[PDB]
Design a protein around this ligand. Structure first.
Ligand SMILES: NC(=O)C1=CN([C@@H]2O[C@H](COP(=O)(O)OP(=O)(O)OC[C@H]3O[C@@H](n4cnc5c(N)ncnc54)[C@H](OP(=O)(O)O)[C@@H]3O)[C@@H](O)[C@H]2O)C=CC1
Ligand SMILES: COc1cc(Cc2cnc(N)nc2N)cc(OC)c1OC
Length: 204
């Protein structure tokens, strides 16, 4: 493939991600961080360059009807059906690769709109397919320092010893460089607990 995928997730230290088909916490600076990262397209390329967000159907269903599609990003919803899709615009694909194929077909060299970065934004199930994909090389993880009760977990303990020779946490300086903006270094406290922004990579 051409472009690598980037995964972006918030999780607890016990790898909880979801509870109620929603996020187990209300963290405004986290969502903001999420918005900036998945939307940032280096300045010289902006009139035409858009980032892609690739999220599973349950995650699509979790976004408030008002906030979807996710603004300023090519939204693509992953589903093993074709189905009926509530899209006034809304791409649909049956796999991560089927989505990539649809994006490169649709947003080619002769396109008014061109793809910059592709983000996988959730679904535990879709986070599982991403973690197995060859082009995934980067996780933008928000670490939440509380064992908040979840019913949905991140599928791979990427920050644990067992996966430390594959997955590596990058200096905060390399995080800022990659995201192209300053990012809060160290713990943030919002709604009763600490969280922080990390960046991990695994060599292609
Ligand atoms: N903390 C965080 O950063 C995030 C947390 N979340 C949370 O995660 C939960 C959602 O996770 P989960 O329930 O697994 O759902 P997903 O969002 O992964 O949606 C799963 C559905 O999407 C489709 N799908 C997912 N992966 C694939 C695949 N590889 N191929 C084909 N279709 C696929 C299938 O749709 P179909 O049934 O149509 O076949 C599947 O039924 C919620 O609790 C949500 O709030 C979500 C994003 C981020
Ligand atoms: C934009 O708001 C939301 C974003 C997400 C995805 C998400 C949020 N934060 C991070 N770090 N990663 C993600 N993949 C998940 C959500 O709920 C499941 C949201 O609420 C509507």
């Amino acid at each position: 493939q051409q472009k690598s995928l980037t995964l972006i997730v918030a999780l607890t230290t016990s790898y909880g991600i979801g509870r109620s088909n929603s996020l187990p916490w209300k963290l405004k600076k986290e969502i903001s961080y999420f918005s900036r990262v998945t939307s940032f397209v280096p300045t010289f390329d902006s009139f035409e360059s858009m980032n892609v967000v690739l999220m599973g159907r349950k995650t699509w269903e979790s976004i408030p009807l008002q906030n979807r599609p996710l603004k300023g990003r090519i939204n693509v919803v992953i589903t093993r059906n074709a189905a009926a899709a509530a899209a006034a615009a809304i791409h649909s694909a049956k796999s991560l690769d089927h989505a990539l194929e649809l994006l490169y077909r649709t947003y080619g060299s002769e396109s008014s709109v061109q793809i910059n970065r592709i983000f996988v934004i959730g679904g535990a199930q879709l986070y599982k397919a991403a973690m197995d994909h060859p082009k995934l090389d980067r996780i933008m993880a928000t670490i939440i320092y509380k064992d908040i009760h979840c019913d949905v977990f991140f599928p791979l303990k990427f920050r644990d010893k067992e996966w430390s020779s594959v997955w590596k946490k990058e200096k905060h300086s390399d995080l800022e460089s990659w995201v192209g903006t300053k990012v809060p270094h160290g713990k943030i406290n919002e709604d009763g607990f600490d969280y922080e922004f990390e960046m991990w990579t695994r060599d292609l």
